[PDB]
């Protein structure tokens, strides 16, 4: 016998494919379908770095009504939606010069 939750947790954020949404702070963010998809993608790889476009090309690869892939800013909205820092998320942005690493904790050594 086996059973799984399909809920994924990192800090005070919980991402949920069992309900296709997310909670933060026990208080129910509800990300957009793509912001949730890309967040899920990163969080489901979390601790591996994901090169911005690799993520978006996994979920979408679309231009919308001329939004010109404002990826770092859109992450800078995931930032306050995941309880994160004022200038960049400790959870996500760049890591060094690469992508979006969704972290588990922000320091290895």
Structural features:
effector domain, response regulator, about 110 residues, monomeric, about 15% strand, three-stranded antiparallel sheet, Arc Repressor Mutant, subunit A, transcription regulator, monomer
Overview of the molecule:
This protein is 28% helix and 17% strand. It has 3 helices and 6 strands; from the N terminus they run βββαβααββ. It has helices spanning 33-44, 53-59, 71-81; strands at 7-9, 13-16, 21-24, 49-50, 93-94, 99-101. It has a single domain, classed as Winged helix-like DNA-binding domain superfamily/Winged helix DNA-binding domain (Arc Repressor Mutant, subunit A), CATH 1.10.10.10. With 109 residues, it is of the alpha+beta class. The N and C termini lie far apart (39 Å). The strands form 2 sheets. Strands 1-2-3 form a 3-stranded antiparallel beta sheet, covered by helices on one side. A 3-stranded antiparallel beta sheet has the order 4-6-5. A hairpin with a 4-residue loop joins strand 5 (93-94) and strand 6 (99-101). The chain is globular, with a radius of gyration of 14 Å. The longest helix has 12 residues, at 33-44. It comes from Acinetobacter baumannii (strain ATCC 19606 / DSM 30007 / JCM 6841 / CCUG 19606 / CIP 70.34 / NBRC 109757 / NCIMB 12457 / NCTC 12156 / 81). It is found in: Cytoplasm. This is Transcriptional regulatory protein RstA.
Q: Please name the fourth-level CATH homologous superfamily.
A: Winged helix-like DNA-binding domain superfamily/Winged helix DNA-binding domain
Strand order of the largest sheet: 1-2-3
What name is given to the CATH topology? Arc Repressor Mutant, subunit A
Number of domains: 1
What is the top-level CATH class? Mainly Alpha
Please report the number of helical segments. 3
> What distance separates the N and C termini?
39 Å
Order of helices and strands: EEEHEHHEE
Biggest sheet layout: 3 strands, antiparallel
If classified by CATH, what would the architecture be?
A: Orthogonal Bundle
Protein name: Transcriptional regulatory protein RstA
Subcellular location: Cytoplasm
């Amino acid at each position: 016998e086996d059973e799984v939750a399909q809920r994924i947790e990192f800090d005070d954020l919980v991402i949920d494919n069992g309900g296709r949404s997310v909670t933060l702070n026990g208080e129910l963010v509800d990300f957009t379908s793509a912001e949730y998809d890309l967040l899920w993608l990163l969080a489901s790889n979390a601790g591996r770095i994901l090169s911005r476009e690799d993520i978006f090309e996994r979920l979408r690869g679309i231009e919308y009504d001329g939004q010109d892939r404002s990826i770092d800013v859109r992450i800078s909205r995931i930032r306050p939606k995941i309880g994160d820092d004022p200038e960049n998320p400790k959870r996500i942005k760049t890591v060094r010069s690469k992508g979006y690493l969704f972290v588990k904790e922000t320091n290895g050594l």
